[PDB]
């Protein structure tokens, strides 16, 4: 790796031997990055050195590659063209993503250059460096010394501004982020890098803009500056290898050159610029005619931004063949540059009949990389995506994926059975998972890759637009959780956030439209998401905000009723249940062998009738356990207790069955441990019970099972409206009274210990002092205050102790049979301290934390018990329809079942009426994003800008044109002079 | 820990803190605020440089017509040599 | 101190540079945690080596 950097580079002296300088380089005693670093030799190949640039070092490919030659003037450049370096090309680079080649000393052009970048990235703030890469000669270094050692990563303490010495040696701009010293073994001459120079800017002009390639080739340009008679020779030995350049209007051999192409005299305009060897020269001004199209001249117009659009026009004249080609080399690479407002303001003003493909290339362009302006710019102008949409180009679509991403990993556990509906399916499932018209696939291209206003735009221009918001907010929560990295696991759930939210504000216009078609949008099978129903997606996906609305809370009431008017009061319903021929008559209203089935069909009196069985059950178990329970034999209606117990064991085995992963679910749980729990104590008592030595335990076990069926009534009664939330709340307030009892229990052993022990009791059980000390200084909180038992003064005196010390007889046949008097007082005093703490500092304070508690609580309990409502109404649907001691036939019913294994057009006339509301959701959103302050203050901004360039041009352009009249009115005057001499 | 570690924590620490500085800026910049203070100075730099053209031009138009005043009569004493 | 306008302004000079190590040690915290529980557990040696 490290060591693989001498391994290849390879340096002569010719004597040539494998190099030692691949540095990890910076400067001391000041704050630039670490630069990387690779000493070269001159005849190698840039094929490597590009794959160290882009591998090894790690860089980004070119959008484009300017390379700066000249310097004649030495010193000090004008500040014309150092505005012209600082504001034409060093934002250039930072706008499109480029690389700037130029000497990477401090001496010639490169000092300016590393000014210009220093200066542009004070006042600039864009999160993002520009790239300079700087090529000198091994010879002229000023301290190569210090870049020897093989290890690897060093840094290398270079040291600059010092031993200032002039001519020879020369130090390195700190300017540069890499840089590449050509070896040429000669260790002090001028350089024969021009060579490896020109192959490593024809092998950059050969390579391909893109993720893997796949764009137009990455356009390289030179730009010139004064220079010298080298330079010209610079000049011819580059354009001999199709590299397109650029011309300053400073002086020396660029001014030659643009006089040359503003029109012997020729010979005498060569004899002055260098003064020096006209013929040859001449040949090379001959070379120059030669090729005659890839020299532009600047200074015609000169402005901000008019540069880049002045180097797309230096590749409009310099293509060659085709101008189809060039405006599509013009298009592609201003997708490429990331610049909309090259675009759409010089390509698409109508000069240019555009075809198809030319577009369609373009937009794949666009697509591979991640260009959202582009593709609402391409798509905006009349193309179909019916024709555009190759398997070709879909497999293309999956193939930029970046190689640590989480799709990398799950497309390659696809290829171990693209694969894309495996995918889908392995994430989601049997239902719920698409298969594998346009729209949906890039809607589902555009969340498998976690893109977002690409994924924003195609949900605005596809269809079936609800159930594809859920399904949205499904999908990024389950790959949210599966991640890797904090960064996006975040940027997933906020983006699950915005889908989440739209699917909100779609279906709340739907539902003021009408009520009936907004529930004929909900309660449909999804063609796209395996056929599931919008409440399951919502379901799945935790859309807790989705079902908290308005619209499908009543709907769920719909649900609930079922066939029956929704708004049928409950005493109705109770005296219709009671007298089954009283449902055909005028009570309630239906409709919203048929109304039979339509009374007993809805999951109201499925119910109710599951409720008035349990409360009938609970009602025996009492009768058998108060009244008639005998010891030797069981009697009838004890026997029907047994029976009754042993068709809820079915039913909680058709619920727990209805294998190993619906028993972990079935053991997860609270209240499927709780209907557990009551079997099995009920099994232990009746196991107990029959056997002759165990009577009583039995007893007793039945008794305490009736408490935990009987707790059971209240998670049956959490599908109600009025009592549902409350019943949530009520789970959420033990962590208030674990503090209270932690408090009160330290406080009790307090008091209580210290009270048994003042007081002196005769009778010295163990339970009896476990009485006495935690028995009863727990009822005082309750109001039960015994002072006959701890109080002599309300006592009677006695000689009750054999022993020294005055002692007293309390009432009580558990109060201790004698009991001292000694410092009786501090025992009034403890009774008056506990009351105290006890029965206002710490019942106050347990209020005052319920109130509190409650309040922060009561927003979150309600949404999450109108998220679960679904849960409880469905699972209130698929039940066997007969009461628990009738559902054993419904069993069997099942078990031998066991042993013997809308239309199309109002579909359409649905989804239409959908996207309707949909573009007048998106058409009201976009006016009231425009119409804001924030939005009308940038526009007026952009007008000012506008008029301050207006007011630029006339101030100096009405100068030349009041000076030019007066260059008439001068002589004129003079003439009429010259007239007057005449006269 | 060792040495190499903690030159690798600091510049670490000191990237997530240049983000942090660069993207507090772009927040205070883009606000509505900071955008009415350019605004306002834009503004009063269109008002400097009307009011040179004002005055400039009405010099200049004087000076086209001092020019204009005697080619006219000089063209009446070219009407006089008529 | 013994000036309440120079009093006040320490005062409320450090809770800005509160406020920035608090920011700061956020977007620390976001991107990694190992990483950030190593920032904080360390011995600066500008500090008398105090955590
Ligand atoms: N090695 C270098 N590479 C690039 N730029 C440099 C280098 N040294 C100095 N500069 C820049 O040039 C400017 C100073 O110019 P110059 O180097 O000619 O004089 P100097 O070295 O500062 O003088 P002295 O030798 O007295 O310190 C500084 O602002 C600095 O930014």
Redesign the interface.
């Known amino acids: 790796p490290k060591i693989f950097r001498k391994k290849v580079c390879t340096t002569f002296i010719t004597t040539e031997k494998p190099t030692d300088a691949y540095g990890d380089l910076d400067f001391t005693y000041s704050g630039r990055k670490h630069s990387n670093f690779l000493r070269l030799s001159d005849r190698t190949d840039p094929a490597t050195v590009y794959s160290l640039v882009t591998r090894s070092w790690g860089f980004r490919a070119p959008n484009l590659v300017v390379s700066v030659l000249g310097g004649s003037g030495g010193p000090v450049l004008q500040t014309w063209l150092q505005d012209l370096l600082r504001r034409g090309l060093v934002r250039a680079a930072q706008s499109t993503g480029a690389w700037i080649v130029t000497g990477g000393l401090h001496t010639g052009i490169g000092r300016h250059v590393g000014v210009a970048v220093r200066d542009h990235q004070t006042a600039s703030?864009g999160?993002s460096k520009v790239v300079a890469m700087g090529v000198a000669p091994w010879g002229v270094v000023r301290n190569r010394d210090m870049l020897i050692n093989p290890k690897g990563s060093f840094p290398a303490r270079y040291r600059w501004r010092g031993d200032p010495e002039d001519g020879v040696e020369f130090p390195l701009d700190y300017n540069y982020s890499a840089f590449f010293l050509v070896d040429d073994g000669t260790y002090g001459r001028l350089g024969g890098e021009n060579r490896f120079r020109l192959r490593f800017e024809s092998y950059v002009a050969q390579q391909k803009t893109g993720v893997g390639g796949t764009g137009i080739d990455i356009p390289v340009l030179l730009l010139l500056i004064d220079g010298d008679e080298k330079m010209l020779k610079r000049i011819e030995d580059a354009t001999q290898a199709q590299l397109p350049c650029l011309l300053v209007a400073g002086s020396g051999g660029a001014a030659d050159c643009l006089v040359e192409t503003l029109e012997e005299a020729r010979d005498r305009i060569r004899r002055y610029f260098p003064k020096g060897d006209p013929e040859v020269l001449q040949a090379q001004v001959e070379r120059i005619m030669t090729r005659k199209e890839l020299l532009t001249v600047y200074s015609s117009e000169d402005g901000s931004e008019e540069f880049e659009t002045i180097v797309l026009r230096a590749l409009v004249k310099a293509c060659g063949s085709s101008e189809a080609s060039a405006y599509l080399d013009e298009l592609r690479l201003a997708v490429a540059w990331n610049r909309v407002d090259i675009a759409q303001s010089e390509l698409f003003r109508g000069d240019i009949q555009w075809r198809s493909f030319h577009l369609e290339a373009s937009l794949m362009d666009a697509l591979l990389n991640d260009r959202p302006e582009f593709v609402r710019l391409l798509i905006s102008h009349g193309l179909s995506l019916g024709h555009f949409l190759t398997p070709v180009r879909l497999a293309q679509l999956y193939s930029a994926v970046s190689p640590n991403s989480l799709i990398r990993n799950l497309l390659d556990q696809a290829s171990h059975a693209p694969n894309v509906g495996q995918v889908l399916r392995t994430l989601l499932g049997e239902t719920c998972a698409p298969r594998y018209a346009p729209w949906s696939d890039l809607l589902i291209w555009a969340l498998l890759l976690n893109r977002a206003q690409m994924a924003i735009y195609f949900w605005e221009k596809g269809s079936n637009s609800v159930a594809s918001a859920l399904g949205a907010c499904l999908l990024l929560r389950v790959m949210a959780r599966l991640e890797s990295e904090?960064?996006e696991a975040?940027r997933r759930k906020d983006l699950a956030a915005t889908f989440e939210s739209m699917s909100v504000d779609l279906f709340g216009e739907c539902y003021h439209n009408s009520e009936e078609r907004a529930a004929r949008l909900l309660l449909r099978r999804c063609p796209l998401w395996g056929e599931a129903t919008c409440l399951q997606l919502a379901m799945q996906a935790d859309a807790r905000a989705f079902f908290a609305q308005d619209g499908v809370q009543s709907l769920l009431t719909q649900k609930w009723w079922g066939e029956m008017d929704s708004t049928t009061p409950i005493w109705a319903l109770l005296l219709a249940f009671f007298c089954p021929p009283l449902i055909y008559t005028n009570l309630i209203v239906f409709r919203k062998s048929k109304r039979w089935s339509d009374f007993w069909g809805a999951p109201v009196t499925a119910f109710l009738g599951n409720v008035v069985s349990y409360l009938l059950f609970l009602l025996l178990f009492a009768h058998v356990l108060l009244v008639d329970f005998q010891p030797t034999k069981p009697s009838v209606s004890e026997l029907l207790l047994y029976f009754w117990a042993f068709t809820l064991l079915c039913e909680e085995l058709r619920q727990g069955l209805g294998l190993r992963h619906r028993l972990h679910l079935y053991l997860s749980d609270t209240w499927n441990q709780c209907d557990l729990l009551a079997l099995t104590c009920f099994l232990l008592g009746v196991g107990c019970r029959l056997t002759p030595g165990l009577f009583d335990l039995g007893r007793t076990v039945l008794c305490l099972d009736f408490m935990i069926f009987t707790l059971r009534l209240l998670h049956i009664f959490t599908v109600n409206k009025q009592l549902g939330p409350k019943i949530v709340i009520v789970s959420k307030m033990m962590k208030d009274v674990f503090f209270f009892l932690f408090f009160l229990c330290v406080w009790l052993v307090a008091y209580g210990v210290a009270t048994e022990g003042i007081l002196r009791p005769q009778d010295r059980s163990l339970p009896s002092i476990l009485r006495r000390v935690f028995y009863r200084p727990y009822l005082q909180i309750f109001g039960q205050i015994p002072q006959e038992e701890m109080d002599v003064a309300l006592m009677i005196p006695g000689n009750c102790s054999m022993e020294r010390g005055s002692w007293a007889h309390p009432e009580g046949p558990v109060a201790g049979s004698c009991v001292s008097q000694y410092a009786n007082w501090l025992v009034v005093l403890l009774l008056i301290v506990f009351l105290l703490v006890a029965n206002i500092l710490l019942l106050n304070l347990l209020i005052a934390m319920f109130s509190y508690t409650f309040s922060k609580v009561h927003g979150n309990s309600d949404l999450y018990w109108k998220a679960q409502r679904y849960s409880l109404i469905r699972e209130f649907h698929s039940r066997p329809a007969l009461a628990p001691p009738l559902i054993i036939i419904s069993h069997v019913r099942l078990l031998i079942k066991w042993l013997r294994r809308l239309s199309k057009e109002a579909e359409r006339k649905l989804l239409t009426w959908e996207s309707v509301h949909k573009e007048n959701f998106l058409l009201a959103q976009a006016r009231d994003k425009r119409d804001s302050?924030?939005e009308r203050?940038?526009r007026?901004?952009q007008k000012?800008?506008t008029?301050?360039k207006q007011?630029?041009q006339?101030?100096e352009y009405?100068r030349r044109l009041?000076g030019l009249?007066?260059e008439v009115?001068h002589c004129?005057?003079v003439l009429?002079w010259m007239?007057?001499a005449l006269?």
Request: proline share 0%.
């Open positions: 703030t999160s904090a960064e975040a302050d924030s203050l940038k007026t901004s000012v800008d008029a301050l007011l630029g006339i101030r009405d009041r009249e007066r009115q004129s005057r009429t007239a007057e006269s």
